[PDB]
């Protein structure tokens, strides 16, 4: 699974996820990547792409969940991604990357590693696998 989330200078959010799926899967099995609200979501206020155990991401509607907690709990991006990873997974292993319409970028995951990189216009730039 790979992915990208972007907020441009106009404050418009977008998200995109692609995968080959699970090794040794049988034909016709579909995971979370193509499923709106699970692996990929974007709206007025954010853009999210998820990766990890599709079972957990699907039942947890994980990407839409970032948007829902911003919306209905009034949390800002970082705290919302924090909330989702911490409360909407337990025993499930997943991670996600997100942007807000305000120009923030956040990543979160609850396994051992996640290949990710982020940047913002004023010059923050990080590429990381571990914590």
């Amino acid at each position: 699974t790979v992915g990208c989330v972007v907020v441009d200078r106009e404050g418009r959010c977008a998200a995109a996820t692609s995968t080959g799926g699970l090794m040794n899967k049988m034909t016709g099995r579909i995971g979370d990547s193509p499923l709106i609200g699970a692996g990929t979501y974007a709206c007025d206020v954010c853009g999210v792409s998820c990766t990890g155990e599709g079972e957990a991401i699907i039942r947890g509607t994980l990407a839409r969940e970032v948007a829902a907690v911003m919306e209905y709990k009034g949390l800002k991006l970082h705290q919302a991604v924090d909330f989702v990873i911490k409360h909407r997974l337990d025993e499930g292993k997943a991670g996600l990357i997100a942007v807000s319409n305000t120009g923030e970028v956040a990543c979160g995951f609850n396994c051992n590693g996640m290949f990710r990189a982020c940047a913002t216009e004023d010059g923050f730039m990080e590429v990381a696998i571990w914590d």
């Binding site: 790979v2 998200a15 040794n24 579909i30 692996g39 974007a42 396994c111 913002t120």
Partner: protein, 157 residues
């Protein structure tokens, strides 16, 4: 109030990742992020940026999508992808692709040209050809690393 971008190449990393591969992965993420930065510096819309970055992630054989994708039990590639544009929550998704060089761009075309938001398998392969996108033999997507990985997967019992 400015641009921001994140890219990922998957969760689930094994702590014994060799240094070699660690460095490749970082080099690839940098390259893809820089492509995205550069498109954002020159005022390319968010929706075009995500597609552009993910196409590069698909092309590179290192991570699990596009060429370098995980293999099915029969040893072939079946790919899937989705895309969403936030301002009007416009969605496109594709599954069961075996021939489409860049699934994410097909997902983009579902979003823009289809009355549906998700097309899969034969239908989706038929839509690709109607849309004129690049299509290739399934073998194209299959690398030696993954043939080995699937050997192990199947040994795993």
């Amino acid at each position: 109030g400015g641009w921001a971008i994140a890219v990922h190449g998957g969760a689930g990393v094994d702590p014994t990742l060799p240094l070699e591969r660690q460095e490749e992965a970082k080099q690839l993420l940098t390259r893809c992020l820089n492509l995205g930065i550069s498109a954002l510096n020159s005022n390319v819309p968010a929706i075009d940026v995500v597609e552009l970055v993910v196409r590069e992630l698909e092309t590179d054989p290192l991570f699990n999508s596009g060429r370098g994708s995980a293999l099915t039990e029969k040893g072939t590639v079946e790919m899937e992808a989705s895309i969403m544009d936030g301002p009007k929550r416009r969605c496109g998704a594709v599954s069961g692709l075996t021939t489409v060089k860049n699934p994410i761009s097909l997902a983009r075309l579902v979003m823009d040209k289809s009355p549906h938001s998700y097309i899969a398998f034969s239908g989706a392969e038929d839509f690709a050809r109607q849309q004129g996108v690049e299509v290739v033999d399934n073998e194209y997507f299959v690398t030696p690393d993954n043939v080995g990985m699937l050997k192990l997967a199947k040994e795993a019992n």
